[PDB]
Enzyme design. Structure first.
Site, mmCIF file in Angstrom:
data_model
loop_
_atom_site.group_PDB
_atom_site.id
_atom_site.type_symbol
_atom_site.label_atom_id
_atom_site.label_comp_id
_atom_site.label_asym_id
_atom_site.label_seq_id
_atom_site.Cartn_x
_atom_site.Cartn_y
_atom_site.Cartn_z
ATOM 1 N N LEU A 22 -2.095 5.694 6.516
ATOM 2 C CA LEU A 22 -0.970 6.376 5.895
ATOM 3 C C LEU A 22 -1.169 6.386 4.375
ATOM 4 C CD1 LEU A 22 1.996 5.097 8.018
ATOM 5 C CD2 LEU A 22 0.443 6.978 8.423
ATOM 6 N N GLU A 30 10.728 1.662 8.620
ATOM 7 C CA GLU A 30 10.354 3.031 8.986
ATOM 8 C C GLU A 30 9.463 2.970 10.242
ATOM 9 O OE1 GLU A 30 7.845 5.653 9.068
ATOM 10 O OE2 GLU A 30 9.611 6.900 9.532
HETATM 11 N N1 LIG Z 1 2.432 10.050 8.482
HETATM 12 C C1 LIG Z 1 2.432 10.212 9.803
HETATM 13 O O1 LIG Z 1 3.568 10.401 10.515
HETATM 14 C C2 LIG Z 1 1.169 10.231 10.582
HETATM 15 C C3 LIG Z 1 1.142 10.598 11.933
HETATM 16 C C4 LIG Z 1 -0.074 10.760 12.600
HETATM 17 C C5 LIG Z 1 -1.247 10.567 11.901
HETATM 18 N N2 LIG Z 1 -1.183 10.195 10.575
HETATM 19 C C6 LIG Z 1 -2.406 10.050 9.768
HETATM 20 O O2 LIG Z 1 -3.108 11.279 9.943
HETATM 21 C C7 LIG Z 1 -4.511 11.027 10.059
HETATM 22 C C8 LIG Z 1 -4.991 11.341 11.478
HETATM 23 O O3 LIG Z 1 -4.635 12.687 11.770
HETATM 24 P P1 LIG Z 1 -5.706 13.897 11.763
HETATM 25 O O4 LIG Z 1 -4.982 15.196 11.721
HETATM 26 O O5 LIG Z 1 -6.801 13.679 10.748
HETATM 27 O O6 LIG Z 1 -6.435 13.709 13.209
HETATM 28 P P2 LIG Z 1 -5.966 13.772 14.767
HETATM 29 O O7 LIG Z 1 -5.365 15.093 15.047
HETATM 30 O O8 LIG Z 1 -5.204 12.567 15.170
HETATM 31 O O9 LIG Z 1 -7.412 13.678 15.453
HETATM 32 C C9 LIG Z 1 -8.275 14.796 15.331
HETATM 33 C C10 LIG Z 1 -9.210 14.748 16.537
HETATM 34 O O10 LIG Z 1 -8.418 14.690 17.711
HETATM 35 C C11 LIG Z 1 -8.935 15.590 18.690
HETATM 36 N N3 LIG Z 1 -7.892 16.618 18.870
HETATM 37 C C12 LIG Z 1 -6.871 16.936 17.995
HETATM 38 N N4 LIG Z 1 -6.102 17.899 18.563
HETATM 39 C C13 LIG Z 1 -6.603 18.178 19.795
HETATM 40 C C14 LIG Z 1 -6.220 19.056 20.810
HETATM 41 N N5 LIG Z 1 -5.165 19.860 20.693
HETATM 42 N N6 LIG Z 1 -6.954 19.092 21.971
HETATM 43 C C15 LIG Z 1 -8.048 18.277 22.129
HETATM 44 N N7 LIG Z 1 -8.434 17.415 21.133
HETATM 45 C C16 LIG Z 1 -7.711 17.367 19.990
HETATM 46 C C17 LIG Z 1 -10.270 16.111 18.180
HETATM 47 O O11 LIG Z 1 -11.197 15.147 18.621
HETATM 48 P P3 LIG Z 1 -12.589 15.483 19.367
HETATM 49 O O12 LIG Z 1 -13.602 15.892 18.321
HETATM 50 O O13 LIG Z 1 -13.001 14.221 20.071
HETATM 51 O O14 LIG Z 1 -12.269 16.626 20.297
HETATM 52 C C18 LIG Z 1 -10.037 16.015 16.679
HETATM 53 O O15 LIG Z 1 -11.232 15.900 15.960
HETATM 54 C C19 LIG Z 1 -4.697 9.570 9.706
HETATM 55 O O16 LIG Z 1 -4.783 9.466 8.291
HETATM 56 C C20 LIG Z 1 -3.396 8.965 10.167
HETATM 57 O O17 LIG Z 1 -3.105 7.760 9.506
HETATM 58 C C21 LIG Z 1 -0.001 10.048 9.906
HETATM 59 N N1 LIG Z 2 8.227 8.319 11.464
HETATM 60 C C1 LIG Z 2 6.926 8.096 11.601
HETATM 61 N N2 LIG Z 2 6.332 7.117 10.852
HETATM 62 C C2 LIG Z 2 4.992 6.825 10.953
HETATM 63 O O1 LIG Z 2 4.496 5.949 10.234
HETATM 64 C C3 LIG Z 2 4.247 7.540 11.879
HETATM 65 N N3 LIG Z 2 2.904 7.291 12.048
HETATM 66 C C4 LIG Z 2 2.199 7.997 12.988
HETATM 67 C C5 LIG Z 2 0.791 7.553 13.349
HETATM 68 N N4 LIG Z 2 0.497 6.201 12.881
HETATM 69 C C6 LIG Z 2 0.869 5.079 13.517
HETATM 70 C C7 LIG Z 2 0.355 3.863 13.071
HETATM 71 C C8 LIG Z 2 0.800 2.661 13.604
HETATM 72 C C9 LIG Z 2 1.771 2.670 14.597
HETATM 73 C C10 LIG Z 2 2.249 1.367 15.151
HETATM 74 O O2 LIG Z 2 1.448 0.231 14.987
HETATM 75 N N5 LIG Z 2 3.404 1.299 15.782
HETATM 76 C C11 LIG Z 2 3.758 0.136 16.577
HETATM 77 C C12 LIG Z 2 4.294 -0.999 15.715
HETATM 78 C C13 LIG Z 2 5.541 -0.557 14.971
HETATM 79 C C14 LIG Z 2 6.124 -1.702 14.174
HETATM 80 O O3 LIG Z 2 5.460 -2.721 13.899
HETATM 81 O O4 LIG Z 2 7.295 -1.636 13.776
HETATM 82 C C15 LIG Z 2 4.768 0.520 17.608
HETATM 83 O O5 LIG Z 2 5.117 -0.302 18.496
HETATM 84 O O6 LIG Z 2 5.267 1.665 17.566
HETATM 85 C C16 LIG Z 2 2.293 3.877 15.044
HETATM 86 C C17 LIG Z 2 1.842 5.079 14.513
HETATM 87 C C18 LIG Z 2 2.837 8.963 13.747
HETATM 88 N N6 LIG Z 2 4.162 9.228 13.584
HETATM 89 C C19 LIG Z 2 4.869 8.519 12.644
HETATM 90 N N7 LIG Z 2 6.198 8.811 12.512
#
Ligand SMILES: NC(=O)c1ccc[n+]([C@@H]2O[C@H](COP(=O)([O-])OP(=O)(O)OC[C@H]3O[C@@H](n4cnc5c(N)ncnc54)[C@H](OP(=O)(O)O)[C@@H]3O)[C@@H](O)[C@H]2O)c1
Ligand SMILES: Nc1nc(=O)c2nc(CNc3ccc(C(=O)N[C@@H](CCC(=O)O)C(=O)O)cc3)cnc2[nH]1
EC number: 1.5.1.3
Length: 186
Positions: A22, A30
């Site tokens: 993140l 959160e």
């Molecule tokens: N702030 C938040 O709420 C939150 C939530 C989620 C993630 N994140 C962050 O976002 C980043 C990860 O997300 P990202 O967008 O880079 O990657 P991602 O979508 O989680 O992973 C991408 C990989 O997933 C597979 N994939 C994705 N969509 C697919 C689909 N529709 N069908 C089949 N395969 C699919 C592909 O793998 P293959 O090459 O193996 O096919 C692709 O290379 C990290 O930095 C994480 O910490 C943050």
């Molecule tokens: N609202 C929101 N916040 C996020 O941080 C978030 N992150 C992702 C992807 N990243 C992650 C990373 C860690 C965990 C995780 O360890 N969750 C555990 C522990 C939560 C806790 O310790 O409170 C879980 O049980 O959900 C979930 C999603 C997707 N949607 C989100 N959505």
């Protein structure tokens, strides 16, 4: 049979990720909100399903994988089998949603939560049907390399209030944020 929902936390500049994690430091309450929303089923005896891309799966700390109390499904077109600890592997969002309706999951799954990353969020947001977006607005800019797709604010409407969600500005580690819920009906 269950509802379809996305959940995300996003910075003002629309960032969700940086260098495989993140963009902001851990916001413990959160994260607990993410846990509560994705885990809480509306039907006794059923669990929710979380759908995520492969990079999102590996961005979760190993100690917390699979996410407890939820059925964990990873999207990948390359993997032959789900990553160690994950319950299911699908090749597309539509394949995953179809799986939830088949006998192996039909009596097991209530809500479906899309938990990222960018590609699956974009596709889910435009998928036909009733859909809610649970968006935490992190009220600062953060350097990011992964972004949430723009929300169409005619297509989706902000609910003014939502049961079970705090409306006031929250703050942890000097970072203010607010919980929002958006909905479209078809
Ligand atoms: N702030 C938040 O709420 C939150 C939530 C989620 C993630 N994140 C962050 O976002 C980043 C990860 O997300 P990202 O967008 O880079 O990657 P991602 O979508 O989680 O992973 C991408 C990989 O997933 C597979 N994939 C994705 N969509 C697919 C689909 N529709 N069908 C089949 N395969 C699919 C592909 O793998 P293959 O090459 O193996 O096919 C692709 O290379 C990290 O930095 C994480 O910490 C943050
Ligand atoms: N609202 C929101 N916040 C996020 O941080 C978030 N992150 C992702 C992807 N990243 C992650 C990373 C860690 C965990 C995780 O360890 N969750 C555990 C522990 C939560 C806790 O310790 O409170 C879980 O049980 O959900 C979930 C999603 C997707 N949607 C989100 N959505």
């Amino acid at each position: 049979v269950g509802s379809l929902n996305c959940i995300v936390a996003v910075s003002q500049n629309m960032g969700i990720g940086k260098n495989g994690d993140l963009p902001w430091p851990p916001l413990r309450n959160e994260f607990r909100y993410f846990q509560r929303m994705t885990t809480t089923s509306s039907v006794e005896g059923k669990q929710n399903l979380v759908i995520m891309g492969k990079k999102t799966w590996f961005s979760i700390p190993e100690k917390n994988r699979p996410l407890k109390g939820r059925i964990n499904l990873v999207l990948s077109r390359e993997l032959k089998e789900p990553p160690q600890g994950a319950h299911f592997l699908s090749r597309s969002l539509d394949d995953a949603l179809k799986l939830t309706e088949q006998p192996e999951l039909a009596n097991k799954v209530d809500m479906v939560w899309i938990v990222g990353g960018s590609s699956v969020y974009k596709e889910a947001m435009n998928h036909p049907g009733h859909l809610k977006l649970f968006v935490t607005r992190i009220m600062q800019d953060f350097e990011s390399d992964t972004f949430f797709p723009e929300i169409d604010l005619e297509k989706y409407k902000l609910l003014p209030e939502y049961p079970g969600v705090l409306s006031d500005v929250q703050e942890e580690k000097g970072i203010k944020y607010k919980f929002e819920v958006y909905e479209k009906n078809d």
